[PDB]
Write a protein that binds this ligand. Structure first.
Ligand SMILES: OC[C@H]1O[C@H](O[C@@H]2[C@H](O)[C@@H](O[C@@H]3[C@@H](O[C@H]4[C@@H](O)[C@H](O)[C@@H](CO)O[C@@H]4O)O[C@H](CO)[C@@H](O)[C@@H]3O)O[C@H](CO)[C@H]2O)[C@H](O)[C@@H](O)[C@@H]1O
Ligand SMILES: [Ca+2]
Length: 250
């Protein structure tokens, strides 16, 4: 049986607010709203969290029963849709250990892993993969290109107990190697963390309108691939046809 540590598909309406916490660290964080956007694969299935305010910081997080990846695989996966045609704005997640105050979470709150696309003008169009190791946040030595169009894309990070990793975009490998070689941190336990307890969205955006959906944290690579195909894989073609429709009808 795959261990599902966390899963969020926003399938139950306004009830998501019972599972996600707004940080109060700042008084003027932008608001996340539940939305399937202007075009979608399915009105209900493609409901996710959308940034609703221009030129704001965002800080929202969801807790889950704490776990450790010691001795097993860790997979983190979600969809990002920059439906607005984004100029500058984050689309990554952070994983936090136990002890985070969700009501006070912010950009400098200490995290274990940060992963996902970041866009900031043409000069920043990169997928971050950051490991906190011995008091330092270490950025991956590799250039992974992020998606910049208006459509929904799947982002997957896989971390293995043999100190290997893989990054997938749209369920397809884009980068692969070992933690020893692709970060400037030999330690057999680089991969492992004593606890994960919270998934956070800590973002700055200029033009807002990005939608996040289909969050998954699991110990099973095969299950993540399947879940990805059943979520993003299903959204992909349907949403393209409805975008094609809207252009032709205009
Ligand atoms: O990028 C690695 C870094 O990520 C996390 O920290 C993020 C940064 O603190 C910051 O992200 C930057 C922000 O840049 C802009 C704005 O804040 C600047 O004042 C302005 C002037 O130069 O430029 C931008 O408008 O947002 C962009 C777009 O996402 C980012 O690319 C920049 O990196 O803010 C975000 C949100 O709070 C932080 O997540 C990690 O915490 C950190 O450890 C890591 O080194
Ligand atoms: Ca959804």
């Amino acid at each position: 049986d795959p261990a599902i540590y966390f899963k969020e598909q926003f399938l139950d309406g306004d009830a998501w607010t019972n599972r996600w916490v707004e940080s109060k660290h700042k008084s003027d964080f932008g608001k996340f709203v539940l939305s399937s956007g202007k075009f979608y694969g399915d009105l209900e299935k493609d409901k996710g969290l959308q940034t609703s305010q221009d030129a704001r910081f965002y800080a929202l997080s969801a807790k889950f029963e704490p776990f450790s990846n010691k001795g097993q695989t860790l997979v983190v996966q979600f969809t990002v849709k920059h439906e607005q045609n984004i100029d500058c704005g984050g689309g990554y997640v952070k994983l936090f250990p136990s002890g985070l105050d969700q009501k006070d979470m912010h950009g400098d709150s200490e995290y274990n892993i940060m992963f996902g696309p970041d866009i900031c003008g043409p000069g920043t169009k990169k997928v971050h993969v950051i490991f906190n190791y011995k008091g330092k946040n270490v950025l991956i030595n590799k250039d992974i290109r992020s998606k910049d169009d208006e459509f929904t894309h799947l982002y997957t990070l896989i971390v293995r107990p043999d100190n290997t990793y893989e990054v997938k975009i749209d369920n397809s490998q884009v980068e692969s190697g070992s933690l020893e070689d692709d970060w400037d941190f030999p330690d057999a336990n680089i991969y492992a963390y004593d606890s994960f307890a919270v998934l956070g969205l800590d973002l700055w955006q200029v033009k807002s309108g990005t939608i996040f959906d289909n969050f998954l944290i699991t110990n099973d690579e095969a299950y993540a691939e399947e879940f990805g195909n059943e979520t993003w894989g299903v959204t992909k073609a349907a949403e393209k046809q409805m975008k094609d429709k809207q252009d032709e009808e205009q």
